[PDB]
Amino acid sequence: MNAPDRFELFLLGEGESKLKIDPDTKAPNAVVITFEKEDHTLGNLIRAELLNDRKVLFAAYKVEHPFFARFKLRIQTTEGYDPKDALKNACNSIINKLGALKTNFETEWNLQTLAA
Amino acid sequence: MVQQLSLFGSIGDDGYDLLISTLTTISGNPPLLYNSLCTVWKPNPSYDVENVNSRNQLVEPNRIKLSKEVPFSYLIDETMMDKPLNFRILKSFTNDKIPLNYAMTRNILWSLQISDIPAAGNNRSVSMQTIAETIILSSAGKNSSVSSLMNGLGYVFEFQYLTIGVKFFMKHGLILELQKIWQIEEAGNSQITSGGFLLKAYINVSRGTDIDRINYTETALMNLKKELQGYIELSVPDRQSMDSRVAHGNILI
Amino acid sequence: RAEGPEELARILQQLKLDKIIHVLTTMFENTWSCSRIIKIDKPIRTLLQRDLFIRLPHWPLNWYLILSIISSKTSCVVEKRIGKIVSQRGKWNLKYLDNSNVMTVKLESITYQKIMILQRTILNRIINHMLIDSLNQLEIRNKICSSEMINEQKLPQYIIQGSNTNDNISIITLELESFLEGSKALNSILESSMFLRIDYSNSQIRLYAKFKRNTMMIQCQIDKLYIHFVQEEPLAFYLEESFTNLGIIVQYLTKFRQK
Amino acid sequence: MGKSAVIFVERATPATLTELKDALSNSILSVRDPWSIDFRTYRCSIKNLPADVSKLMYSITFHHHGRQTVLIKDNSAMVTTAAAADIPPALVFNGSSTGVPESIDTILSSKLSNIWMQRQLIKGDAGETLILDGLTVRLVNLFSSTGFKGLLIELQADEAGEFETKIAGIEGHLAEIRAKEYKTSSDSLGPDTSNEICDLAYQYVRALEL
Amino acid sequence: DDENITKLNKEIRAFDKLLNIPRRELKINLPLTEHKSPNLSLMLESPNYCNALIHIKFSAGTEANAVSFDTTFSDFKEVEDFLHFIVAEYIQQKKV
Numbered sequence: 001m002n003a004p005d006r007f008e009l010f011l012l013g014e015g016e017s018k019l020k021i022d023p024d025t026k027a028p029n030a031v032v033i034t035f036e037k038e039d040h041t042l043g044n045l046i047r048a049e050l051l052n053d054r055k056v057l058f059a060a061y062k063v064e065h066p067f068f069a070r071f072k073l074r075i076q077t078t079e080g081y082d083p084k085d086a087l088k089n090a091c092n093s094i095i096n097k098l099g100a101l102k103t104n105f106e107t108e109w110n111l112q113t114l115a116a
Numbered sequence: 117m118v119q120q121l122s123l124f125g126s127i128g129d130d131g132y133d134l135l136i137s138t139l140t141t142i143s144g145n146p147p148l149l150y151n152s153l154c155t156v157w158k159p160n161p162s163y164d165v166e167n168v169n170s171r172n173q174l175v176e177p178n179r180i181k182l183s184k185e186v187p188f189s190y191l192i193d194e195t196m197m198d199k200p201l202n203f204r205i206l207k208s209f210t211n212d213k214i215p216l217n218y219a220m221t222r223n224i225l226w227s228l229q230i231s232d233i234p235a236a237g238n239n240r241s242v243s244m245q246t247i248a249e250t251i252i253l254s255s256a257g258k259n260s261s262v263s264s265l266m267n268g269l270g271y272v273f274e275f276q277y278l279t280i281g282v283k284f285f286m287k288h289g290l291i292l293e294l295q296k297i298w299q300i301e302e303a304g305n306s307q308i309t310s311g312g313f314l315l316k317a318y319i320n321v322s323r324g325t326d327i328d329r330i331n332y333t334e335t336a337l338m339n340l341k342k343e344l345q346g347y348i349e350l351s352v353p354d355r356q357s358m359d360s361r362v363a364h365g366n367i368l369i
Numbered sequence: 370r371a372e373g374p375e376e377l378a379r380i381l382q383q384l385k386l387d388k389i390i391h392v393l394t395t396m397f398e399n400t401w402s403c404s405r406i407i408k409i410d411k412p413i414r415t416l417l418q419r420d421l422f423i424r425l426p427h428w429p430l431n432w433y434l435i436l437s438i439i440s441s442k443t444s445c446v447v448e449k450r451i452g453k454i455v456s457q458r459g460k461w462n463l464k465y466l467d468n469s470n471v472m473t474v475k476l477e478s479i480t481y482q483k484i485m486i487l488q489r490t491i492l493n494r495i496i497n498h499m500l501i502d503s504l505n506q507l508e509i510r511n512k513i514c515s516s517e518m519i520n521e522q523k524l525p526q527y528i529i530q531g532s533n534t535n536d537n538i539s540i541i542t543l544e545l546e547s548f549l550e551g552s553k554a555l556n557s558i559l560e561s562s563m564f565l566r567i568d569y570s571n572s573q574i575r576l577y578a579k580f581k582r583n584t585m586m587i588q589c590q591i592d593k594l595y596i597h598f599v600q601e602e603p604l605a606f607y608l609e610e611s612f613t614n615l616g617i618i619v620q621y622l623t624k625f626r627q628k
Numbered sequence: 629m630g631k632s633a634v635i636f637v638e639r640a641t642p643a644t645l646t647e648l649k650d651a652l653s654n655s656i657l658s659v660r661d662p663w664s665i666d667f668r669t670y671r672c673s674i675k676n677l678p679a680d681v682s683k684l685m686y687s688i689t690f691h692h693h694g695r696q697t698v699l700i701k702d703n704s705a706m707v708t709t710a711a712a713a714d715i716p717p718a719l720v721f722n723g724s725s726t727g728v729p730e731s732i733d734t735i736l737s738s739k740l741s742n743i744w745m746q747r748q749l750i751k752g753d754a755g756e757t758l759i760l761d762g763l764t765v766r767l768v769n770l771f772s773s774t775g776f777k778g779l780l781i782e783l784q785a786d787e788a789g790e791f792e793t794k795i796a797g798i799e800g801h802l803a804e805i806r807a808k809e810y811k812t813s814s815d816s817l818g819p820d821t822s823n824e825i826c827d828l829a830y831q832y833v834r835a836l837e838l
Numbered sequence: 839d840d841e842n843i844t845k846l847n848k849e850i851r852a853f854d855k856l857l858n859i860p861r862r863e864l865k866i867n868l869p870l871t872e873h874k875s876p877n878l879s880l881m882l883e884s885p886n887y888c889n890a891l892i893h894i895k896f897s898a899g900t901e902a903n904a905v906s907f908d909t910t911f912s913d914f915k916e917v918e919d920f921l922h923f924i925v926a927e928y929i930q931q932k933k934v
Contacts, residue, residue, distance in 0.1 A: 011773055014749070118726045148840045150722045159743075163674045167742040175742050183724035188839065202841045227724040230739055248739060249729045250708055251715060253696075256818050256826040257704035268685075268701050270674070270743050283723070293723065322728050399909050399920060406656060430654055456650045458643070481923045 009069045010037055021084070030058065030076040031083045037069045046073065049090040055081050121333050122243045122318035123341060123350045127294075129210065129312055135348070136203065139284050139292070142343065147203045147282040147294075151191065153221070154279070155182045155262075157271040158362055177362040180271055181229040182252075182262065190216050191280070203282050209296060210311070216278060218302045225263045225273075226252040233359040242337050243352050246324070276300055281313070288336050292317045297369060308369045317341075317350065386417050386440050389476070393438075397423060400484055404433070407454065409461055413437055415448060422454070425488075431455055431464065432495050445476040451491070451498050467498060493536050496615070500541065503619060510547040514540035514564075527599045528564050528577055537569040545578075548626065557581065565622075574612050576625040580604040594628065631788040632828050633795055633814035636835040637807050640779035645767050647805050648781075649756065658759040663766060664691040665752045665780075667836065670736055670744040685744065687733060688829045697732050698829035705817055705826040708732040749773065750836070752780060762787065763794055779807075780835075782828075811835055860884055868928065874899025876906070876928070892917055896924060 012018065016036055024030035035042065043061040050059040058076035075083040127135060140146060157180045159165065168175065188201060193215045199205060230248045234240075255265065263273065281295035295314045299306050317340060319333045341350045357368040371377050394403060404422045412418050419438040437448040449472035453465040497513060504511050514524055519532065524540065532538045545561045546553065560579040567574050580587070583604060591598075599605040608625050612618060637644070666689035677683070686700040694714060699706040709715075710731040719725040736744050755768030764784050770777040783798065785791055795814065802810060813834040816827050866878040879895040891912055898906035907924075911917045 014773075117730050118728060120726070146842055148721075148842070150839070152722050152724055162676070164676050165674060165742055167673045169742075175739075177742075178739070183719075185718045185722045185724060200841055201839060227719050228735075230735070247726060248735060249726050250710070250732050250735055251719070251725065251729050253707045253709050253714070254823060254826075255704075255706050256821050256823045258818070259704055260818075260821070264704065265706055268704065269740070291723070320726050320728075395909075395916070399907060406653075406659065456653045458650070459646055481926075 008037075012037055024074065024076075027058070027076055029079065029081070029083065030074065033073045033075070033087075035071055035073065038071060039063065039069055040071075043071045043073060045094060046087070046090060049094050050075065050086060052093075053077075053086055053089065056086055117246065117248045119321040119324045119330065120243075120245045120247055120318055121321065121330070121337060122245065122316060123337055124243070124317075124353045125315040125348050125350045126309075127313050127315055127348055132207070132294075132313060135294075136282070138347070143284050143286045143292075145285055147284060149188075149201065149203055149205075150283055151186055151188065151278070151280045153184050153186050153224075153276065155225075155276045156180070156274045157182065157266050158274045160267075160270055160272050163270060178230060178232075179274070179360045179362060180266070181231075182266070183227045183229065184224075186216070186224075186278075190220060206280065206282065206296070209280060212298075212305060212307045212310075214278070214298050214305050216300070217305070218300060221276060221300060225261060228252060231360060233361070234355050236355070241352070242334055243355075243358070245358065277308075286340075288319070288332075290317065290319050290336060290340065299369075315348065315350070382417065382440075386419060386438075389440065389445060390419060390421070390438065393479070394421070396479075396481070396484065400481065400488070402426065407433075407461055409454075409463060413450075413463075413466065415439055416441055422452075428492070428495065429499055432499065434491060435466075447474045447476065447479065448472070449474065449487070451495055453502070465502060470494070490536060493539065497539055497541070500615075500618070504543075507619065508547070508550070510544040512542045514542060525564070525577070525579070525602065525605065527601045527605065528566055531568075535568075535570065537571075539567050539569075541565045541567075548622070558584075567618075572612060573609060574618065574621055574625075575607045575609050576622075577605060577607040580606070596628070629788060629822060630784060630786050630824060631791045631814070632782065632784045632824070632831060633791070633812060634828075634831040634835040635781040635783075635798070635802075635810050635812040637779040637781070637802070637810045638777075639809050640807065642769075642776060644779055644805065644807065645756075645769060648767065648779075648802065649758075651801055651805060652758070652760070652765070655760050656758050657761060660757045660759065661692075663755045663757060663768070665689065665755075665768070665832075666691075667750040667752075667832070668733065669747045671747045673743055673745050686833050687736070688832055689731075689733070690825065690828075693825060696825060698826060699732065700829060700833050703817060703830075705823070705829065707823070707825060750777065755780075765798075782832075859887070870899060870932070872899075878924075890914070894920065 018036055020034040020036075022032045022034075024032050040063065043063070047059050047061050050056050055078045056075070057078065058074065061071055061073045063071045075086060077083050077086050136147060159177045165177065168177065191214065192205075196205065196208070228250045232246045234243050234245045252262075252265075255261075266272070276299075278298045278300060279295050280298075281293055284292040286292065293316045295309070295316065296307065297309045297314065299308055317337065319337060321329055321333055323329075344350060353368060357366060359366070371380055397403065401423055402425060404424070407422050409420060413420055413435065415437060417438075417440045419440070421436045421438065422433045423436065424433050431453050433452055433454055435450045435452045437450070439446045439448065450470070451467050452463065455462050455464050501511055501513070518524065519529060519540070522529070524542075528540060532540075541564070543563045543565055545556060545559055545563055548563060549555055558581065560581055562579075564577040565574065566577065577599070579602065581604075587598060587603060587606075595610075596606050596608055599607065608628050610621055610624065612621055666687075668687040668689075670685040670687065672683045672685075682702045684701070688698045688700070690696050690698070695709070695711050696714075697708045697710070699708070708731075710729055712728060715725060715727070715729075720727055737746060750770055750772050752768040752770050755766055757764060757766045762785060766782045766784075768780050770780055781798070783794065785794065791814075795812070799810070799812070813831050815831060815834055816822070817830040861881065861883050863879065863881045866880070868876055868878070870876065876899045877895075877897045879897075881893045881895075883891045883893070885891060889912065891910060892914075893910050894907070894917075895905060896907045897904070900906070909920070911920070
């Protein structure tokens with residue numbers, strides 16, 4: 001049997017970096033960032049958030065083969081602005097949105113329990 | 117970890133003095149006195165190592181060497197402080213008796229070292245051996261001692277011996293050693309190299325993959341051997357004598 | 370290893386700038402704790418500008434003496450101010466900056482004696498500024514009775530009395546409406562301006578107010594209310610209290626306000 | 629004689645390190661180069677063992693203290709080096725050493741692999757070191773195989789007179805950031821024999837145990 | 839151990855007084871009353887055999903270990919300026 005172990009989907013191997021950043025040689029201010037042990041759940045969210053920044057020109061991701069858990073992201077931003085900073089802003093905005101969502105759901109659930 | 121490339125030989129003490137002079141005529145350096153003390157440790161037979169993969173032979177048990185330098189104040193008796201500390205003192209070291217006895221060495225209890233049998237094949241002109249080495253700097257705790265440490269790892273004492281000799285440093289990192297070996301037991305001290313000196317010329321290579329360096333090292337060793345033709349015959353020892361695995365017992369001395 | 374003529378000119382300009390910076394930093398350290406960690410995103414508004422943030426261990430927290438060094442091709446000047454900076458989530462935030470009391474000083478005039486006199490006066494200046502900031506947190510308007518203000522004799526003379534050119538006495542003019550948090554029913558009784566005088570040597574806080582109209586109730590004995598009326602100005606009274614910690618002075622003010 | 633202490637916080641957040649870095653920013657005098665640390669546990673593979681003989685062996689590798697490994701077993705310490713510049717000259721001269729040793733972790737995991745086998749590995753990289761008034765504080769995030777583990781704080785001072793006061797102050801500083809479950813340790817391996825790095829490794833072991 | 843290495847070590851160490859870096863120290867004690875005697879210790883060194891480094895330690899008459907000032911200087915002009923400042927400070931202290 002040649003079936004790989006399932007835990008290779010969520011445990012990094014030794015000597016593995018969760019992120020790898022590489023400058024793109026074709027378009028200025030463009031970076032290709034490889035994420036490991038991740039799938040569409042994160043890439044879709046990050047790209048949809050990166051599309052809201054008026055200084056972000058290009059943002060696209062892909063998962064080359066459905067056997068391996070990894071994906072590539074590509075970012076291109078305006079002059080005088082770092083793609084890593086854009087990624088940081090996107091992550092901060094996502095975290096704030098999720099926190100607000102959690103607080104709202106807890107308030108509504110407690111109100112329902114009072115009305116239960 | 118090094119690849120040590122070595123050649124061996126022996127001489128009778130009668131020519132000893134003469135030999136020394138000739139070496140200084142070649143190297144241009146004077147000999148330097150040295151000594152050492154080695155203790156050999158073997159895996160504990162009380163513990164059954166079933167982990168030795170018998171169906172595959174991934175590994176075989178081996179013996180560990182712990183070495184240390186001992187000051188000459190333990191090796192010089194009350195008759196010898198008058199002479200200066202130089203190589204000539206070796207001329208008086210012909211008796212099986214020695215000032216360092218069993219009790220002092222027991223009171224003592226560094227460099228940790230493991231080796232493998234030399235490389236196989238009959239197309240090798242020098243003894244090539246692989247050595248893995250580490251250093252112990254200090255320790256602490258309620259049982260800080262070499263014996264307690266090696267029993268913690270899982271090893272026990274087997275025997276020990278004492279080397280005294282002289283060193284010559286030549287070009288290209290070549291080291292030439294003249295040694296005398298005294299085995300030590302509670303029963304007493306016996307000189308195995310009785311009435312002679314053991315000669316060993318060797319070089320160290322840091323990386324085994326580099327082959328230009330290894331070829332250069334072999335060239336230097338064979339040139340040195342071809343220089344000493346007619347006086348001393350330097351030879352490759354027996355490959356089965358430098359094997360230090362526990363399963364089979366023999367000791368090149 | 371420089372490559373460009375513009376690079377060489379920039380190198381020499383930076384050489385002059387940081388040589389001056391090193392000289393003055395050594396001057397401060399030979400007498401002062403600078404900070405080499407703080408980086409502000411935007412240079413402070415006042416040609417090369419360099420910001421240096423200095424303080425002392427016994428100063429109030431987050432209060433820094435800020436020096437803006439402005440270097441030109443032929444002349445250099447120093448802007449000395451007092452500011453409040455905090456660090457939050459890896460960022461330096463300019464919490465507060467003072468611009469009404471900017472000390473613009475030429476490079477040559479600065480000497481050791483001026484440095485030590487500034488060291489002595491800056492503690493009182495920072496205490497006044499932090500009192501101002503606390504009152505702003507209380508949303509109370511205020512104005513500083515500086516040395517020039519006191520010398521102009523526009524303030525009431527009884528307040529100036531006892532201030533024998535001592536830096537331990539600080540007088541601040543407060544608005545009656547602001548100190549009362551908008552109580553407009555008391556504007557017709559007391560003057561719109563009150564005076565807070567704090568003596569560090571005496572550790573005393575006095576709130577002086579002036580009656581807008583002469584009420585006959587002054588003739589009555591008000592000794593039981595800890596109110597002392599000014600002999601020179603019968604319409605002027607004051608409340609005197611003793612304080613030990615400045616951080617709780619706000620409560621004292623409320624106590625005064627209560628009275 | 630210098631003194632040291634180690635505090636480990638298990639329920640920390642990813643941003644707790646930044647929170648403690650900023651909460652101490654008033655007293656921060658300077659910052660120095662980053663550090664790293666490794667923590668392995670080796671297990672005994674032999675079954676014919678006595679009841680009183682321990683089974684584990686903790687290896688702690690210090691990167692900033694000149695690349696040194698410390699092996700700990702049953703309150704017994706062993707300090708090994710692997711740099712050519714730490715070798716006592718006598719061993720080089722007499723021939724007891726070839727001059728280019730290996731780390732003891734390679735020896736345990738290559739030649740003695742039939743007695744000892746690895747069981748876990750906890751790493752810490754890109755820590756920050758801050759100089760406060762008569763104090764040095766080092767912070768780092770601990771990463772296991774699965775992911776983030778917790779926060780590690782190590783304090784070192786030269787004067788031992790007021791060490792307890794500094795420890796209490798740092799504990800209070802953590803207290804305002806509402807990190808209430810923290811395990812601290814400043815014990816000494818040997819009351820009579822004082823080795824700094826051995827005691828530091830023992831304190832690490834006592835802090836990191838579960 | 840061996841005679842040759844000790845002989846060479848002895849012969850080389852014999853030249854320390856010539857090869858070693860020159861150093862100088864000057865201690866100045868100022869006569870002051872009220873059992874308050876400040877000390878001024880100036881040590882001059884040439885770490886790279888050509889540059890002059892002047893380390894100044896001025897201890898005011900308050901405590902035996904409370905060093906009022908401890909500074910280093912590489913420019914003689916700044917040395918003279920700080921000496922003048924210290925003299926002025928001492929004069930002011932004597933005037934108060």
